[PDB]
Subunit: 398 residues, 4 copies
Amino acid sequence: EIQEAYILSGARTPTAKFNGSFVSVSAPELGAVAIKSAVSKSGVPVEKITDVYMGNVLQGAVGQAPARQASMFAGLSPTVESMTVNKVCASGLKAVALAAQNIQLGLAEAQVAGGMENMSRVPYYLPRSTQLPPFGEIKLQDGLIQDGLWDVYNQFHMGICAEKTAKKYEISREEQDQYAIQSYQRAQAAWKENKFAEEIAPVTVKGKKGETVVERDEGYENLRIDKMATLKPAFLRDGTGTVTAGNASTMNDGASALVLGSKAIAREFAQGNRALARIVSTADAAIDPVDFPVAPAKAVPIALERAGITKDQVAVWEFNEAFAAVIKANEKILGLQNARVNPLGGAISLGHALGSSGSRILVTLLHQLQPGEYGVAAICNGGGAATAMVVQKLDRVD
Amino acid sequence: EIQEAYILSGARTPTAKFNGSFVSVSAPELGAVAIKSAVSKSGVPVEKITDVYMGNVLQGAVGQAPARQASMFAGLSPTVESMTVNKVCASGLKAVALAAQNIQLGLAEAQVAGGMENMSRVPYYLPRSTQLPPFGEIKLQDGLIQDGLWDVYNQFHMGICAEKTAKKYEISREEQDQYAIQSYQRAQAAWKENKFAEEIAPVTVKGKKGETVVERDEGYENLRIDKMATLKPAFLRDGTGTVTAGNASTMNDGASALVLGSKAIAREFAQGNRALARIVSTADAAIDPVDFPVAPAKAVPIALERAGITKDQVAVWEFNEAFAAVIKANEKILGLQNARVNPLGGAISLGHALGSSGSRILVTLLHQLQPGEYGVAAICNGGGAATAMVVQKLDRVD
Amino acid sequence: SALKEIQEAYILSGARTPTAKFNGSFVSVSAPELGAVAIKSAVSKSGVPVEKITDVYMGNVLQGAVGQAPARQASMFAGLSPTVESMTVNKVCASGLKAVALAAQNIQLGLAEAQVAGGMENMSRVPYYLPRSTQLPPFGEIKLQDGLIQDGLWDVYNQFHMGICAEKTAKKYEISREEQDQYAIQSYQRAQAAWKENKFAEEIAPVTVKGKKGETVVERDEGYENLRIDKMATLKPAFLRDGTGTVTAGNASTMNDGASALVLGSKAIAREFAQGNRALARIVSTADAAIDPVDFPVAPAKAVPIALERAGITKDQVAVWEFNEAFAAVIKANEKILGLQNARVNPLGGAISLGHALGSSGSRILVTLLHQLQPGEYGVAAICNGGGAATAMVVQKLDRVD
Amino acid sequence: KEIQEAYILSGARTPTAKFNGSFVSVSAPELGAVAIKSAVSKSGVPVEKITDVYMGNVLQGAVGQAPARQASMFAGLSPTVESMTVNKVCASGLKAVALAAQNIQLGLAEAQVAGGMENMSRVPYYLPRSTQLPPFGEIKLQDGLIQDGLWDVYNQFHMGICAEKTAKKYEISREEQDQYAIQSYQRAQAAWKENKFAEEIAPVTVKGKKGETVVERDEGYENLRIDKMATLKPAFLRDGTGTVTAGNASTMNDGASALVLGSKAIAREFAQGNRALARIVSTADAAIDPVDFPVAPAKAVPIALERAGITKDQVAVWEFNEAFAAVIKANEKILGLQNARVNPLGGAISLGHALGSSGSRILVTLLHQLQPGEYGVAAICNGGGAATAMVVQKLDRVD
Ligand SMILES: CC(C)(COP(=O)(O)OP(=O)(O)OC[C@H]1O[C@@H](n2cnc3c(N)ncnc32)[C@H](O)[C@@H]1OP(=O)(O)O)[C@@H](O)C(=O)NCCC(=O)NCCS
Ligand SMILES: CC(C)(COP(=O)(O)OP(=O)(O)OC[C@H]1O[C@@H](n2cnc3c(N)ncnc32)[C@H](O)[C@@H]1OP(=O)(O)O)[C@@H](O)C(=O)NCCC(=O)NCCS
Ligand SMILES: CC(C)(COP(=O)(O)OP(=O)(O)OC[C@H]1O[C@@H](n2cnc3c(N)ncnc32)[C@H](O)[C@@H]1OP(=O)(O)O)[C@@H](O)C(=O)NCCC(=O)NCCS
Ligand SMILES: CC(C)(COP(=O)(O)OP(=O)(O)OC[C@H]1O[C@@H](n2cnc3c(N)ncnc32)[C@H](O)[C@@H]1OP(=O)(O)O)[C@@H](O)C(=O)NCCC(=O)NCCS
């Protein structure tokens, strides 16, 4: 009765800087680029793909039905069904977990799933006339802040949440910054050898003169060891701050996508796929909103149990580097310091376009795997939660 | 080992009019009132409920993680996972189907699911500094139009889609107004017989001068039979037009929620439950974006084949009345013109809070079925899709 | 042209529109459209042929979104020829009076024989400010200032409302909550009484507002029947919430929409066309003075003596005083300093009860002052203005010039 | 009781900065304060004698309360100094000087400060209050620069359109306009190579997060590109008949300017030998139909010449604001000033046009070009159909 789901491909766009190369390109347009490549590399006749699920946290001004736009701009048939998913930062992974379910229940044989975000293109919000005062100062919220990084209950940024955790586990400035430098170092190492060449789909942004062709993550080069310890705290300006702009994730523009199928679909069209893998298990989990940084420490045991697997059978972990504070706490709680986490860099140097990051880390994870090895992809999200996915890399199906 | 999933309760707030009673109540607050009533009427201990899935189409300035807010403002534990869903007008019904998938897969035993929408509180968009011109006039889009009711591909209103449907299937102005007059009469007859007292959870509005319990839907009493045939078409003003404000659905604020159950949970805690039912099947289907009004005609026959029944075995049909033209088209294509279709009114008279509408017709449907009878909830969404659910009403499970 | 000796200037006519409430009857009517209504009526009542009027000077504090050259619009909307010259004046609340004094200098120098001066203000229509792309942050909360506060009611140097300036003056000159309230109650009474006898009928130019399906004619001031005597002593201070607060919404002026205008002329023009004019009077003197920005409520105490000295008259020779009632605190401090306690200051009400359309107020008080004087009588219009300043004018009511 | 004369004792201007350039963080009143401070220092008059500050400012949105008060106060002038912000559109700065002159003429004052200021970069967009907003649907937000500064109310078009119509009527062709515009740039460059503007310019110290910048040079006079000039699209009329371009029109800029005026007595006791010493002989304002605002200086000049008792041939240097090349070319035809000394060191096309300061900026530039005893004319047109003209006479001493 219940079947399993296979990843056939993975294609993310280059992660652009805030107010950078993708300011002209809507999140769906980025999404379509990531989709068009992923299908191409999967092998499956498109006709077999039936649904497109895409994460998107900030849908303000994106237009009607963001995920639908991705599907249409990708050249997929109006006949394909779609849905825009919002689990804050877990959105991209969750969209893959849900697309999996259509296959696990036999409802479909091929699905497209991932995430997209253009944080440069998020608007400010001007209330309509019945919610404006008759006179006096009006405060306009950015939307990146209000809907993306502002905790509703404690009424403070996600960076304060990261301070309260960095305090509670005795994580210090100098090891947050060491982790950051390492993030950047690993990202530079990786780009020197062009370790993301195969996984990246290049974005042709046209405008005025002719066409740029963007191929390269923006922000990984830009590390300056000297300044790193001089960097002022970014959220906590009371004396005790530790999280800075250098040791936090950056705001970014980009999109990622994966093609999924049944056993039957893989066997018939995707046996020698670069990305090839089996979705072993997934799991969500929630705790108090403040404690969102460790919510991965609660969602990975579950996914692992559901996997029938232990910490020590997992080759490479890919946690989303939302802060250095975060990774380091989750490393100390799961006892993974001496394990292969974010070998090619993370959100601190590779960027963090919200709705995409869940699926982007998976795409990166699938290209660092030897046949038979177990991969984990985990990602915290605001509100107090995470989702983790256990996958296994394969050369073939049977 | 694919499981069955049961609806155990169904609750909704009153549908308030645009710029009316709920201008100060956010969509998650309204969704939280509807969630509180559904968990109470379910009769299942809160601890077995592990996920909240809520539709919300226009998430702008609602705050981080709208569905999570709903879950928390209703007093569900920080430990319950959540996800905000966007399939436009179909979001609430899709949210139900997703919660079902969890039970159907054995990942949970109880879910809550539905939708919320505050169209009054949808903001205007102000692009950030990098997307504003150096000088000259700037046009701020209203979120209702840009993300809610504007087709991305053809660049016109949803009700131009309705017009191009009414032309194709020869549904005249007179036929459209006749159906709208019937919708209002059915809503008035239902409100006069108090047919919604059981499904409605009142809303407590905290003003300055005391409180206000809102218990009545707003809009359904505003019919003037005289003026209905003299209204000016609201979308097509070139003299060919047919869709008016009267024969179309209004913009409203409201929320709806249902508790879902495994067979085991239903048998142990929901015997005799007023709204008890089994989900027999669910289907999504998509076509050309222009043709989103006739997408139910493509989803309904799919959900009936998965349910193993035919059109003739369903006792009550609940199709969202986005426009009168929408219903009359689908009744013609499906041969349901003499069937029991929206007997207690619909969105023309009872309103249309985008992300709640899909699950609101579900709640309304459950209260009109006799034990052993099949019902069908179908709702079209922007982009060219529709979601349909077949349900079998029960008195007890054996 | 020019002239070797300073000539005399006379006011031939005076008109004002009703003073409407903030966000009230004039939301659809721009300050120059309002100015134009007052202007049309003033030239119509003056008896001088329009070809003789050569310049229009109108006061206007908040000019955002009003369009190019606001005083030029009042002129063209009043039907004056395109050859008449114009200028928009900004001396904050003293704008309307200052425009009169400037229009009188043209006649005093012999450069002109007939002028139009006054002021207009539509506080409902002043907008919010959104800075352009280069002055906005890349991200984060944006604060939109309301032009009323940023450009009209906010001190630049002290960074506080004009009502805090009123607060510090009330303390300095020991003006109590009770005196403030008692003054405001009187203003309301004096206005109600004045309105019951139709005292404003001659000076008021009605406004016709084209609304959706049909026209509405406005000829009555809005806000003067809004006194509830018993609530007065209970109102929360509007600006100072630390316990020392004293100024409230009942004892302070309101924000309003209105316009006022006068025709002025040379002796020769007055003799030929305005001998029995209802409003006919001579501008005897003007004076502007300034002190520290926080002490603006008492700047009129500095302007008045200078104006009186330039007129060769004493306090005791002034029949009716018309001081803008910015706050009750302001009027009482100025009565203290000048020893007017037992004088007739604002007999038919003022700003507290009849409103305060900023740039129109200076010429609105003049218009009201000219309709209350008897032949030969000396009148004084004075008005403080933010930044620390005031302007006073002495006039002499006459039946004829010879 | 007898009308007297007014004298100019000193003049300065800040440098004219480019739109969105060096002065985006410096408000018009701060720019004003720099020019007032320099004019007051160079006048040689004790500061207790100056009693009024009249400053032009056209776009007063978000500048704060009483912009001319701010200018006075930021220059360290005392709070007893009276002030007023004047709005005659582009004539604002010249009209302020005339008004200050009137006080001295009527004997109400012995020393005055007058000039103009504008920060076009800092002009804001206008958002209406809740009672003027539609309850739903698209909202259009006007730029103040367009709505209040450059849009004719009666004809509902840009000032550049008014320029096109004066070009048609006076047969000024795209070629004539470009030649005059090129010429303006070359004069400006010539003047900057000879450091002609050093005596009148008051440097602006712009505070920054990473250091202070001292701006002492006009911005935009090197942007001439003769090649490009004839290949430019019409800026305002795009119906195939347009002749006005960004090249041959004035630019938008930020800047200020200021002069100290005085009575004969004050001039004699403290300003003998002052570089900018001159006598205000006459001033005139004039208006006609709004669309004909570009030819309005032609009505104003004759009146000012008549009141000064001089002929057009008796004026050594003419300073007409170069709002567009077409306006200068049309005014030269009407007045017969084809071979006259007109805008010899350049003008608004190359040197910029900070709306409320231009009127007084051309006067400052004029005063530094005149020989002792020579007559000069400053004239500037303004939106709505008007113009202001001032006749001066350069002096070495008063007697
Ligand atoms: C940090 C953040 C808040 C914005 O930072 P910012 O204010 O734009 O910071 P900048 O990029 O200007 O950098 C600040 C300084 O650090 C320096 N800096 C940047 N990257 C650096 C690096 N790798 N090494 C050293 N210094 C660095 C910058 O050069 C700058 O110095 P400068 O001002 O002298 O130029 C945002 O990027 C962010 O990631 N915040 C949280 C993101 C998020 O999603 N939060 C929750 C996730 S669940
Ligand atoms: C209603 C809507 C179409 C815009 O119309 P509107 O301008 O708000 O119209 P209103 O309802 O305010 O009033 C329109 C007129 O019709 C009248 N009217 C409306 N319903 C009526 C009825 N049942 N009987 C009689 N008269 C009625 C009103 O009284 C009014 O008369 P008036 O113009 O003489 O004052 C708007 O809700 C919209 O944008 N579309 C609906 C949302 C939608 O399309 N959703 C579908 C998503 S799939
Ligand atoms: C003072 C000011 C802020 C008042 O704004 P506001 O709060 O909107 O004023 P309100 O509409 O609240 O004034 C009425 C309020 O006080 C009460 N009130 C006001 N005037 C009253 C009176 N004369 N008698 C009794 N009650 C009165 C009203 O009933 C209401 O109280 P409520 O809320 O309990 O019903 C405003 O008028 C202002 O900014 N102007 C003062 C200064 C100024 O305009 N410029 C200075 C000139 S240089
Ligand atoms: C200020 C103004 C110049 C700005 O217009 P703009 O469109 O930004 O023009 P730019 O300065 O960008 O230049 C336009 C083009 O001409 C070019 N150009 C500008 N000045 C030039 C010059 N002197 N020589 C050659 N080419 C020039 C630019 O490089 C650009 O070409 P590009 O497309 O290759 O970049 C003008 O359009 C304007 O609005 N002026 C208002 C007129 C006014 O002040 N009225 C006052 C009435 S009294």
